[PDB]
Each structure stands twice: as C-alpha cells, then as structure tokens.
Amino acid sequence: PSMSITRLFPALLECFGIVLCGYIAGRANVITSTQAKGLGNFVSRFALPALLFKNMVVLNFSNVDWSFLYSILIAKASVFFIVCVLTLLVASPDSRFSKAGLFPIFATQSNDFALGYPIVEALYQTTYPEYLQYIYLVAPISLMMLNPIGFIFCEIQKWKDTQNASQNKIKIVGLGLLRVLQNPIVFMVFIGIAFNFILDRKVPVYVENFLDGLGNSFSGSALFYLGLTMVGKIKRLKKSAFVVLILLITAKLLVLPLLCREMVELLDKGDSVVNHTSLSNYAFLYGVFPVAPGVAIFATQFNMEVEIITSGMVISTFVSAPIMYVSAWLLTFPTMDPKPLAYAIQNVSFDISIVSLISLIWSLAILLLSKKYKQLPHMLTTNLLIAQSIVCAGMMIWNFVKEKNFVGQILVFVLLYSSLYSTYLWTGLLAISLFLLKKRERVQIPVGIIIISGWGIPALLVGVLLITGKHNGDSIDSAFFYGKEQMITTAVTLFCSILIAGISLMCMNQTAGDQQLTRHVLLCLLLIIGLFANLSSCLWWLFNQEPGRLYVELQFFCAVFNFGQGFISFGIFGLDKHLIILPFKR
Ligand SMILES: CCCCCCCCCCCCCCCCCC(=O)O[C@H](COC(=O)CCCCCCCCCCCCCCC)COP(=O)(O)OCCN
Ligand SMILES: CC(C)CCC[C@@H](C)[C@H]1CC[C@H]2[C@@H]3CC=C4C[C@@H](O)CC[C@]4(C)[C@H]3CC[C@]12C
Ligand SMILES: CC(C)CCC[C@@H](C)[C@H]1CC[C@H]2[C@@H]3CC=C4C[C@@H](O)CC[C@]4(C)[C@H]3CC[C@]12C
Ligand SMILES: CC(C)CCC[C@@H](C)[C@H]1CC[C@H]2[C@@H]3CC=C4C[C@@H](O)CC[C@]4(C)[C@H]3CC[C@]12C
Ligand SMILES: CC(C)CCC[C@@H](C)[C@H]1CC[C@H]2[C@@H]3CC=C4C[C@@H](O)CC[C@]4(C)[C@H]3CC[C@]12C
Ligand SMILES: CC(C)CCC[C@@H](C)[C@H]1CC[C@H]2[C@@H]3CC=C4C[C@@H](O)CC[C@]4(C)[C@H]3CC[C@]12C
Ligand code: NA
C-alpha cells in the first residue's frame, strides 16, 4: 500500500475528538478563562519549543531530500503570489494592504505540528518514516520565507492610518522581519541547527527524556486548546465575506494541494516510480491541512480583519477532515487490484456510516425532543432520517457478514436496501410535500398514504428483487449482491425519484407554522445531486460492465453519498439547535 490508509480514520477521530472535546468543555464552561490562558501559554512556550528543539537537534541534514522542499516551497510561494496579486487588484483601497498581507498567509500557512503531524505520522510510521522529518522543517522555513512579505504589507496598512505619507521604508521592512524572529518556532529552529553542530546529533539521555515529556504533550494540548478557542468565533458574516471564505479555503485546500503535487512531479526526478508516487501523494496530503491557529493570532496582533480570518481558520479546520480522508483514499485507488479495491470501497462505506449515524442520532434527538415531528414537513424529514439511520446501521452489520452464511446475508441485504430505496424515494416524497405546502391550498396533504408509499414501495421492490434475481455470495459489494436486475431496480428507483423530486421543486417556482421551506428545499436539492451520481453509476455499469476507468472514482463518491447523506441532513437540521429545545432539555 505504501500509505497505511487503514490507520487514517482512527487518527482523524482521535485528532478531531480532542478538538471537539475542547469545544464541548469550553461551551459547557468546564475550563475557565484563566485556565485557558494557562493551557494556551504552556503550549506556545513549553510544549512547542521543546518539540521543535528536540526534532531539529537530532535531524540528519546529510540524508535530507531537499528536492521535496523546493517543490513545496515554490508551490506555497506560487499560491502566495497568486492570492496577494489578486487581492491587491480588486480589494477596496481603504483595507487593501491588510488583506494583501494576511490572506496570502491564510492560504499558505497550515497547521502542521498540532494536527498535520498525527495524520502524517499514522500514515507513514513504517512505510516512509523519513516523510516525518519534512513536516518539521517545511513549516518553519515556509514561515520565514513568506510571512515576512505578508507582515510588511500589514505594516504599510498600519502606517497608512498613521498617515505621514507612508514614510520610514526601512522601519516597515524592519518590523516585518522582526515579528518573524520573535515567533517561537522560527528562532527555536535556529537554536536547533545551532545545537545540531555544537552538541552534534547526539543528545544527553536525561535531556532527551525531558524533551520527550514536553514534546509528546504538544499535539494533545494544542488540539484541545484549538477547540477551546473555537467557542464563539463563527459570526454571521455578510455575503461578500461569505464568498471570500469560499475562495480562501479553496486556495488552501484545493489549489495548494494540486500545486504541491504537480511541482513534485517535475522537481523530483523519482528514479523509483513507486517512491515517486508516494512523494507526490504525500505532497498532495500536506497541502490539504487546515489554516494554522497562529494566523488568527496575527490578525489580533495587527488588529486587522480578525473576523474573516478567525472564521476561516475554524471552518477550514473542520472542512479539511473530509477532504483529507476522501483524497487520501482516492490517491490509493490507482494502485489497487480490483479485488482489494472492492474491500477499499466497503472500508470507506463502513466508517463513513459510523460517523454519519452519530450525526443522525443527534439529529433525531433534536427533531424528536420538540414537537417538530408533529408538524407536517418535519414529519416527512423524520421518516427520511430514520431511513438514513438504518442504511448506516445496515452497512455496519453488512461489513461483518458480507462473506458469511447465506441466511445472514439475505436479511441484512433486505434491511440495507429496503431503507436505501426509501432514502431515494423519500427525497421525491419530501419534495412533493413541499409543493403541497408551498401551493397553500385547503388540501389535507395525505401524509398517511405518503408514509405507507415511502416505506411500502421499497419493500415491494426488494421483494420483487428477491423473487427475480441471482444471488452472489462472492460479491463483496452490496450493490452487486444481485445481478444486473439489482442495477435495473436501483436505476428505476433512482430514475422515478428524480422526476417526482425534480418536477415538484420546479412546480414550486411556478407557484411562487414553523416550517423551513428554504432548509427543506436545500436538503432536497443536495439529495438530488447524490441521485444523479448514483443514477449515472447504474447507467454506466449497464452499458459497460467492465470497471477501471473514472467509474472507480464515481463508485467511491456514490458510496460516500449513500452512507454520508446523514451528514448532509445534520448540517441542516442537526446543527441549528438554537433555543427550540434548549429550554425544553434544560
Ligand atoms: C463560508 C463558507 C465556507 C466554504 C467552505 C468550503 C470552501 C472550499 C471548499 C473545499 C475545498 C476544496 C476541496 C474540496 C472539493 C472537492 C475536491 C477535493 O479536494 O476533495 C475531493 C473530495 O473530498 C471531499 O469529500 C470534500 C467534501 C467534504 C467537505 C465539503 C467541502 C465544502 C463544505 C462547505 C462548508 C461550508 C462552511 C459553512 C460556513 C459558515 C477529493 O480530492 P481529490 O482531488 O479527489 O484527490 C485525488 C486527486 N489526486
Ligand atoms: C458529527 C458527529 C461525529 C457527532 C455530532 C454530535 C455533536 C455535534 C453534538 C454532541 C454533543 C453536543 C454538545 C454537548 C454540550 C454542549 C454544551 C452546551 O452548553 C452547548 C451545546 C453543546 C456545545 C453541544 C453542541 C452539539 C454537540 C457538540
Ligand atoms: C485560487 C482561487 C481558488 C482563489 C484565490 C484567492 C483570491 C483570488 C481571493 C481570496 C481572498 C479574496 C479577496 C478577499 C476580500 C476582498 C475585499 C473585497 O472588498 C473585494 C474582493 C477581495 C479583494 C477578494 C478578492 C479575491 C481574493 C483575493
Ligand atoms: C468521512 C469521515 C470518515 C472522515 C472525516 C472524519 C470525521 C472526524 C469528520 C467528518 C465530518 C466532520 C465534522 C464536520 C463539521 C462539524 C461541525 C462542527 O461544528 C463540529 C465538528 C464537526 C461535526 C466535524 C467533526 C469531524 C468530522 C465528524
Ligand atoms: C427496515 C426495512 C425492512 C423497512 C423499514 C420498516 C418500516 C415499515 C418501518 C421502519 C420505519 C417506520 C416508521 C418510522 C417513523 C414513523 C413516523 C411516526 O409518526 C409513525 C410511525 C412511522 C410511520 C414508522 C412506521 C413503521 C416504519 C415505516
Ligand atoms: C419505481 C417507484 C419509485 C415508483 C414510484 C412510486 C411513487 C413515486 C408514487 C406512486 C404513487 C404516488 C402517490 C399517489 C398519490 C398521491 C396523492 C397526492 O395528493 C400526494 C402524493 C401521492 C401520495 C403520490 C406520491 C408519489 C407516489 C408514492
Ligand atoms: Na506561509
């Protein structure tokens, strides 16, 4: 495999578990403000400098592959230059240099030590341990090369408020470099190389043990402090600020990873094709790291646009987790034999379901604690969320009995795909429900027969599939548990669902309690996109049975939607707890 992709998911939970635990502790006021700074300064003053000093003093510069460095640095520099120039050309002159300083830093600075290292470590503990030393020397070098340019830009903006015709050019440059030296990670690296020759790579045993204690305490503490500070940082920004965050996070998580792997392609000679492929994959994964929390600190120190910088830092942190997981799996696929590749899709489907079900259980708790499920549309959403819960629960059961006794397989397959067809069908039925409510008529909106049709019809389709279908116990994938008839049944279920959902949403436009039409319509539109992917996948297979082309990436994303849709309904209904039940639960 050369990546150890199976250990990625446990690492991501452990890393974002501490962040979530910190956020929960901060929200519940378990940790006071005075303890927050006590933990905050310890990480920045003791845990981090000890970690940085420990690695660089024993680092062997003789065996360092500097080719990977220049590829990452130029990729970072290219993103820095692109963002800086673009934000200079079309930003308002009053706050043009402040944006030109922090925004390129935002799109290039990454959380390599606190969060990047555990994912990099878990993937490359054994296959490529030399990849671990890169992250400790890529990050500080990047900070001393690009941040001075960004820091100088903020000094220009600061001195503009001071007026005085923007003089003291040497002072503006001087303060820019000075702030970089004052950064703990910059000078403690310089001390690391300093002691790398003075003390030599060998270090006293008692010193080494002391540095291990503080060093191993950084990642856990920094991640906990990360989520601790997230409390009350996301504000309802304007549309212009909302669009900018889309572009800035895209530059960090999409443009930067693509540039990092393309520069490695031509910088790195790659005598071994296998080693070249691993380096290119690692370069892609390094680019998709969240914005470092230290960028938000720079905004507060400079008193510039903290709100957009802090919100982007927090959002990019959570957004990167799906991107890190999905991208790392898709990079492995071109080097998978079709049979182990089948296990790869099942492995992704399994662990997406377990995180999705937790979101669905919370979403059901929010929706059923109140009397929302009494209401006409939210009753329809409740049925859809129950269907999604069984689909996620069915995949967990299916994973353990996919290669076991026949009687066990047939019960789980009925359980899994009767609910899966319901989620396809509930998308259309929910869209019909929105049409009736939007039409605003005296009609009684017969939810009684809707619920029967929502669950009964998928049961009939499964029953028809069983009496007319060919069993495959060898089939690892549940989509091919039956023959082409299952794809015909799946395509028919998807096909009819799209029209009834598509037409109903269209009729709402022609037509134009506490029912959220905008939230429900958004949910239906997002679900339909997943129906397009699944319908395309089924039609592609029927015309061409042979896989291997972009089908394999299409199959991966289809499996992501079928069991990840719960996350799509928790983003909408799970998150917005507000006070609809907060007094109720209190
Ligand atoms: C203010 C709103 C903030 C917007 C947030 C999003 C902004 C930028 C979006 C995402 C960054 C770009 C990367 C994701 C797009 C998909 C491409 C990608 O890199 O991920 C792929 C799919 O990964 C995913 O599953 C991504 C989806 C998961 C996260 C969703 C992204 C956007 C979510 C929006 C969040 C909104 C925040 C609300 C703010 C109030 C897999 O990568 P690959 O290119 O196939 O790798 C192999 C190439 N050799
Ligand atoms: C997404 C999957 C993995 C799990 C989702 C569950 C999350 C979103 C749930 C479960 C625990 C919840 C938290 C429990 C405790 C508190 C403290 C309270 O004073 C404010 C709400 C807050 C902060 C809740 C917010 C929502 C929460 C974080
Ligand atoms: C590479 C792609 C994906 C994105 C690149 C990022 C660049 C182009 C983005 C990210 C930050 C953005 C800037 C952020 C805020 C402002 C101020 C506003 O008054 C006008 C637009 C302006 C000036 C934006 C222009 C576009 C911008 C510079
Ligand atoms: C696809 C899976 C297996 C890989 C991603 C790992 C997990 C840890 C990811 C997937 C989606 C992520 C969630 C995305 C958004 C939020 C909202 C935020 O306010 C609380 C954390 C939370 C809930 C994230 C927690 C981490 C998360 C649950
Ligand atoms: C698991 C496979 C076999 C199919 C699922 C079984 C079906 C028949 C079950 C599971 C989900 C169930 C529904 C879940 C939610 C509701 C809404 C509630 O206000 C009345 C009961 C009702 C309408 C349930 C009726 C029975 C039901 C439709
Ligand atoms: C191959 C499968 C998906 C066949 C599709 C059957 C579904 C989409 C159809 C068949 C019968 C239809 C129902 C028949 C009549 C009504 C009454 C109307 O006032 C509300 C919608 C409702 C309740 C329809 C909803 C959609 C429905 C359930
Ligand atoms: Na940078």
C-alpha pair distances (Å), 16 with each of 3, 217, 231, 359:
21, 16, 15, 15
* DSSP H or E stretch at residue 539: helix 517-543
Distance of CA 397 to the CA centre of its chain: 26
Kindly list the protein residues whose Cβ atom lies closer than 6 A to any atom of ligand 3: 83, 86-87, 90-92, 99, 103, 244, 247-248, 250-251, 255
Indicate the DSSP class of residue 62.
G
User: Angle 239-250/306-332 helices, nearest 10 degrees?
Assistant: 40
Candidate of 9, 317, 323 to mutate for ligand 1, largest count of ligand atoms within 8 Å of Cβ: 323
Question: CB neighbours of 435 closer than 8 A, spacing ≥ 6?
Answer: 504, 505, 507, 508, 511
C-alpha pair distances (Å), 343 with each of 336, 364, 394, 413, 545:
10, 31, 17, 17, 19
186, 143 in Cβ contact below 8 A? yes
Q: Which of 179, 220, 211, 184 is nearest to 39 (CA)?
A: 220
Please tell me the distance from the alpha carbon of residue 569 to that of residue 527, in angstroms, as a whole number: 9
CA–centroid distance, residue 429 to ligand 6 (Å): 7
295 alpha carbon, closest ligand: 7
321 alpha carbon, closest ligand: 4
Candidate of 13, 21, 23, 27 to mutate for ligand 2, largest count of ligand atoms within 8 Å of Cβ: 27
Please tell me the distance from the alpha carbon of residue 319 to that of residue 297, in angstroms, as a whole number: 20
119: which 2 tokens? Answer: 């994912």
Cβ of 350 closer than 6 Å to ligand 4, yes or no, is: no
Question: CB neighbours of 579 closer than 8 A, spacing ≥ 6?
Answer: none
519 is in an annotated binding site: yes
Please tell me the distance from the alpha carbon of residue 316 to that of residue 310, in angstroms, as a whole number: 10
Please tell me the distance from the alpha carbon of residue 46 to that of residue 39, in angstroms, as a whole number: 10
Please tell me the distance from the alpha carbon of residue 435 to that of residue 457, in angstroms, as a whole number: 21
Please tell me the distance from the alpha carbon of residue 543 to that of residue 7, in angstroms, as a whole number: 36
Dihedral sign from CA coordinates of 248, 251, 257, 260: negative
Q: Which of 25, 58, 577, 571 is nearest to 319 (CA)?
A: 571
Residues 264-275, buried b or exposed e (16+ Cβ, 10 A)? beebbebeeeee
Residue with CA nearest ligand 2 atom 5: 359
* DSSP H or E stretch at residue 78: helix 66-89
Cβ of 393 closer than 6 Å to ligand 5, yes or no, is: no
146, 104 in Cβ contact below 8 A? yes
Elucidation method: cryo-EM
Cβ of 571 closer than 6 Å to ligand 4, yes or no, is: no
Q: Which of 147, 297, 309 is nearest to 222 (CA)?
A: 297
Query: Resolution of the experimental model in angstroms, please?
Result: 2.8
157: which 2 tokens? Answer: 């903006």
Q: Which of 65, 74, 67, 66 is nearest to 267 (CA)?
A: 67
576, 523 in Cβ contact below 8 A? no
160 is in an annotated binding site: no
SS (H, E, C) 469-530: CCCCCCCCCCCCCCCHHHHHHHHHHHHHHHHHHHHHHHHHHHHCCCCCHHHHHHHHHHHHHH
C-alpha pair distances (Å), 443 with each of 427, 429, 485, 489, 564:
21, 16, 39, 33, 35
Q: Which of 321, 264, 328 is nearest to 289 (CA)?
A: 321
538, 491 in Cβ contact below 8 A? yes
Cβ neighbours around 453 below 10 Å, total? 14
Please tell me the distance from the alpha carbon of residue 3 to that of residue 124, in angstroms, as a whole number: 6
Question: CB neighbours of 138 closer than 8 A, spacing ≥ 6?
Answer: 69, 72, 73, 112, 286
Please tell me the distance from the alpha carbon of residue 68 to that of residue 263, in angstroms, as a whole number: 9
Torsion of CA 518, 315, 558, 282, to 10 degrees: 170
Amino acid at 290: P
Please tell me the distance from the alpha carbon of residue 414 to that of residue 405, in angstroms, as a whole number: 15
112, 139 in Cβ contact below 8 A? yes
| In the block, residue with structure tokens 């960004």 | 150
Cβ neighbours around 263 below 10 Å, total? 22
96 is in an annotated binding site: no
Indicate the DSSP class of residue 61.
G
Question: CB neighbours of 177 closer than 8 A, spacing ≥ 6?
Answer: 148, 151
> Helix, strand, or coil here: 303?
coil
Candidate of 106, 230, 264, 319 to mutate for ligand 1, largest count of ligand atoms within 8 Å of Cβ: 319
Domains by residue range for the chain, with CATH: 5-332 (1.20.1530), 338-585 (1.20.1070.10)
C-alpha pair distances (Å), 530 with each of 127, 524, 534, 560:
36, 10, 6, 9
| Backbone φ/ψ region at 29: left (φ over 0), alpha (ψ -120 to 50), beta | left
231, 26 in Cβ contact below 8 A? yes
Residue with CA nearest ligand 1 atom 13: 254
| In the block, residue with structure tokens 């299409």 | 554
Cβ neighbours around 314 below 10 Å, total? 22
Q: Which of 238, 230, 382 is nearest to 311 (CA)?
A: 230
Q: Which of 312, 314, 321 is nearest to 103 (CA)?
A: 312
Q: What's the N-to-C CA distance of the chain in angstroms?
A: 50
* Side-chain half-sphere CA neighbours of 159 within 13 A: 18
Q: Which of 143, 107, 139 is nearest to 254 (CA)?
A: 107
How many degrees, rounded to 5, is the angle at CA 354 between CA 123 and CA 122? 10
Torsion of CA 448, 358, 427, 450, to 10 degrees: -10
CA–centroid distance, residue 299 to ligand 3 (Å): 17
* Side-chain half-sphere CA neighbours of 107 within 13 A: 31
Q: Which of 377, 381, 353 is nearest to 527 (CA)?
A: 381
* H-type alpha helices, 373-483: 376-401, 406-439, 447-467
Q: Which atom of ligand 6 is nearest to the CA of 428?
A: 8
188: which 2 tokens? Answer: 């403690």
CA–centroid distance, residue 80 to ligand 7 (Å): 7
CA–centroid distance, residue 418 to ligand 7 (Å): 50
How many degrees, rounded to 5, is the angle at CA 501 between CA 239 and CA 525? 20
Please tell me the distance from the alpha carbon of residue 143 to that of residue 128, in angstroms, as a whole number: 25
* DSSP H or E stretch at residue 117: helix 117-123
Dihedral sign from CA coordinates of 556, 557, 558, 561: positive
Indicate the DSSP class of residue 291.
P
555, 341 in Cβ contact below 8 A? no
9 is in an annotated binding site: yes
Please tell me the distance from the alpha carbon of residue 60 to that of residue 272, in angstroms, as a whole number: 22
Please tell me the distance from the alpha carbon of residue 83 to that of residue 104, in angstroms, as a whole number: 5
How many degrees, rounded to 5, is the angle at CA 361 between CA 533 and CA 457? 50
Q: Which of 324, 288, 355 is nearest to 17 (CA)?
A: 355
Residue with CA nearest ligand 3 atom 28: 87
* H-type alpha helices, 256-337: 256-267, 273-287, 293-302, 306-332
Please tell me the distance from the alpha carbon of residue 202 to that of residue 45, in angstroms, as a whole number: 24
C-alpha pair distances (Å), 523 with each of 204, 361, 505, 531:
60, 18, 12, 12
146, 108 in Cβ contact below 8 A? yes
Residues 16-47, buried b or exposed e (16+ Cβ, 10 A)? bebbbebbebbeeeebeeeebeebeebbbebb
Indicate the DSSP class of residue 253.
I
83, 255 in Cβ contact below 8 A? no
Q: How would you class 86 by CB atoms within 10 Å of its CB: exposed for 0-12, middle for 13-18, buried for 19 or more?
A: middle
Residues 484-515, buried b or exposed e (16+ Cβ, 10 A)? eebbbbbbebbeebbebbbebbebbeeeeeeb
State phi, psi for 450 to the nearest 5 degrees.
-65, -45
Dihedral sign from CA coordinates of 151, 154, 158, 160: positive
Q: Point out residues after which the chain has a gap (C–N over 2.5 Å).
A: 512
234 is in an annotated binding site: yes
* Side-chain half-sphere CA neighbours of 359 within 13 A: 22
| Backbone φ/ψ region at 340: left (φ over 0), alpha (ψ -120 to 50), beta | alpha
Cβ of 528 closer than 6 Å to ligand 1, yes or no, is: no
C-alpha pair distances (Å), 260 with each of 108, 199, 279, 280:
11, 35, 10, 8
Number of continuous H segments (helices) and E segments (strands) in the chain: 24, 0
Cβ of 488 closer than 6 Å to ligand 6, yes or no, is: no
